[PDB]
């Protein structure tokens with residue numbers, strides 16, 4: 001994938017409606033269904049403090065960046081088989097670009 005900056009505004013709507021149920025983004029935020037995502041960019045998978053991951057997520061050991069995040073969000077179970085993240089994916093490039101533009105800002 002080749003991330004291209006999009007609309008953080010639209011990305012925020014995508015995050016609220018599709019991700020927020022399971023994830024928080026702020027520093028020291030709680031673990032809902034999934035892990036808090038503060039500082040996710042530049043960190044490896046399966047390493048948020050206090051969260052219990054699948055072995056698959058931990059074994060994947062991916063160093064998250066905007067490009068492999070886009071691939072992941074296209075179809076998470078195809079990128080990390082065995083993950084317990086219940087999310088089908090976002091097929092549209094624009095949606096992934098907008099969401100990741102938001103996520104970069106919201107989790108930094």
Ligand SMILES: [O]C1=C2[C]C3=C([O])C(=[C]C(S([O])(=O)=O)=[C]3)[C]C3=[C]C(S([O])(=O)=O)=[C]C(=C3[O])[C][C@@]3([Br-])=C([O])C(=[C]C(S([O])(=O)=O)=[C]3)[C]C1=[C]C(Br)=[C]2
Pocket residue numbers: 007009010094
């Ligand atoms: O435009 C277009 C179209 C129509 C529309 C519009 O315009 C709008 C919106 C809509 S809905 O339905 O989705 O709501 C439709 C407005 C806008 C918005 C945006 S955000 O960011 O918010 O998302 C953006 C924009 C707009 O306009 C800009 C742009 Br879409 C455009 O316009 C276009 C394209 C683009 S990309 O990204 O893809 O490149 C951007 C154009 C169009 C198209 C269609 Br199919 C429709």
Ligand SMILES: O=S(=O)(O)c1cc2c(O)c(c1)Cc1cc(S(=O)(=O)O)cc(c1O)Cc1cc(S(=O)(=O)O)cc(c1O)Cc1cc(Br)cc(c1O)C2
Pocket residue numbers: 088089090091092093
């Ligand atoms: O909620 S979204 O992710 O935004 C979303 C967006 C669209 C949908 O239809 C579906 C969901 C609905 C949907 C869901 C699945 S699922 O994964 O088994 O749940 C399979 C299909 C499908 O329609 C069949 C299908 C699969 C693929 S793939 O590359 O092998 O994954 C590609 C295309 C397909 O046509 C063609 C296509 C490309 C893009 Br780019 C965008 C769309 C699109 O068709 C629009």
Ligand SMILES: O=S(=O)(O)c1cc2c(O)c(c1)Cc1cc(S(=O)(=O)O)cc(c1O)Cc1cc(S(=O)(=O)O)cc(c1O)Cc1cc(Br)cc(c1O)C2
Pocket residue numbers: 094
């Ligand atoms: O050419 S592009 O600019 O690269 C381009 C970009 C995107 C496309 O899908 C399509 C083409 C492909 C595409 C092409 C046509 S057509 O040529 O008019 O026949 C209709 C659709 C469509 O997907 C269905 C469609 C219609 C509308 S509208 O408001 O009623 O006009 C709005 C949206 C729609 O989803 C949602 C949407 C909004 C924005 Br803002 C951006 C995209 C987007 O979805 C991304």
Ligand code: HEC
Pocket residue numbers: 015018019020021022023033034035040044045046047048052053054056057073082083084085086087
């Ligand atoms: C619950 C129903 C979820 C939804 C909706 C979304 N995610 Fe998720 N995510 C969830 C879980 C339970 C996990 C852990 C997976 C495991 O196998 O242990 C995750 C994981 C992620 C990750 C990786 C985090 C890390 O490695 O530290 C990311 C980057 C992530 N989730 C992002 C994300 C986004 C952006 C979502 C909206 C599109 C989203 N997830 C939906 C649970 C759920």
